[model samples]
Target: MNIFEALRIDEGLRLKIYKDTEGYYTIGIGHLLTKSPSLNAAKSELDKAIGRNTNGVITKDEAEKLFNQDVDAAVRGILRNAKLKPVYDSLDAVRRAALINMVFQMGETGVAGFTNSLRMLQQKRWDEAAVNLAKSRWYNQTPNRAKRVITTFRTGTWDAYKNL
Candidate 1:
C-alpha cells in the first residue's frame, strides 16, 4: 500500500470533533483543527470539502483532504527543519515513512527531542535506533503504532505496516 494510505489506516479516520491521546482537539484523520495556526483556512477548506456548518461532523472524503494536508505538513516540517533534513534524507522510503509517521503523531518538535534516537538513525544503526525509540513514553502510550514504526526503522520493510 502507499505509505500515505498506510498512515491513514494507522491514524484512524474520525468524523467527529474529539481529543487525541495527547489531549489536542482533533477531527478527520487526526487533523488537530485546534493546532491549525489559523483556524480560518481549515474551517473554510472543510466547509468547502463537505458543506457549510457540518455541525461538528465531517464526511470521509472531506477527511481525506484534511488528512492529506496534515501528512504534507508533517513531511514539510521534517523536510525544512535544518536539524532533521540530513536525518530525513538518509533513509529509504519505509524508514522515511517511520519518521513522517512519528512526526504526524507527535509533531516535529516532539520527534526531534529524541536526540540519541535520531543520532542512532543518522548513524544507520537500525536495531539500536529502534532500541532508543522503544525506550520512551510514546512506546508506552501507543505501543502498537510505536511497534510498527520502530520495526519499520529497525528492519526497513513495509511488512510492519501490512495487515495493520
Candidate 2:
C-alpha cells in the first residue's frame, strides 16, 4: 500500500475523544495528549496530520494552524470531485469559505449529498440555500455554526457565531 494508506491503517481513526493505551486523552487517528514536552514534540512530528496541543484543548496558535490545515484539506477533498469544481469555484470567497467549513464538519461525501442545497447554490439562490442549509441535519446538530455559515453564504460576510 501507499504511504498515506499504510499510515492510516496503522494509526487507526476515531471521531470522538478517548484514552489511548498509555492513558492519554486521544482522538482522531491515535492523536495523543500528554504533559511530557518531549513526547508531545515527538508525537507532533510523528503525526503532523492530526493537530493537538500538550493540553487536551488546543491553544489559540495551535488552533489557528489546525484550522488552516483542515480548511485546505476540506477544499481539496471537495474539489476532488470534478463535477463540483465549477460550482464551488463560482462562489465568492465568503461563500467558498462557508462551503469549506461545511465540508470540514461533514466529510466531502456528506456535504456532496446535499443535492437540493447544492442546486440552490449553483443557481445563485441565496435565500433558498440559506434556508436549506439551516434545515439540514448538520444544522440540527450545530445550530449556531450553521447560522454562521448560512448567514455568511447569504450575505457574503464573516460574522462570528457565539458558541453555546
Best of the candidates, TM-score: 1
**1-164, model 1: which lDDT tens digit per residue?**
66687787787878977767776667888777665544464565456656577757788888887888888898899998987888999888878988998898888998889999999899998878888798999999999889988988898888877775
Off by over 4 Å in 2: 1-67, 160-164
Q: What is the lDDT of residue 137 in candidate 1?
A: 99
Residues forming the 10-long window of minimal summed lDDT in candidate 2 = 1-10
- Give the C-alpha miss distance for residue 136 in model 2, angstroms: 1.5
Provide the lDDT at 133 for model 2. 78
lDDT tens digits, residues 45-136, model 2? Answer: 43554443443344444534544555567678878976567668889866776776666656678887888888889899999988887777
Alpha-carbon RMSD to native, per candidate: 3.5, 10.9
Instruction: Write down the TM-score of every candidate.
Output: 0.86, 0.60
Colliding residue pairs in candidate 2: none
Which 10 consecutive residues of model 1 have the lowest summed lDDT?
36-45
Best by lDDT: 1
Estimate the overall C-alpha local distance difference test score of candidate 1. Answer: 0.81
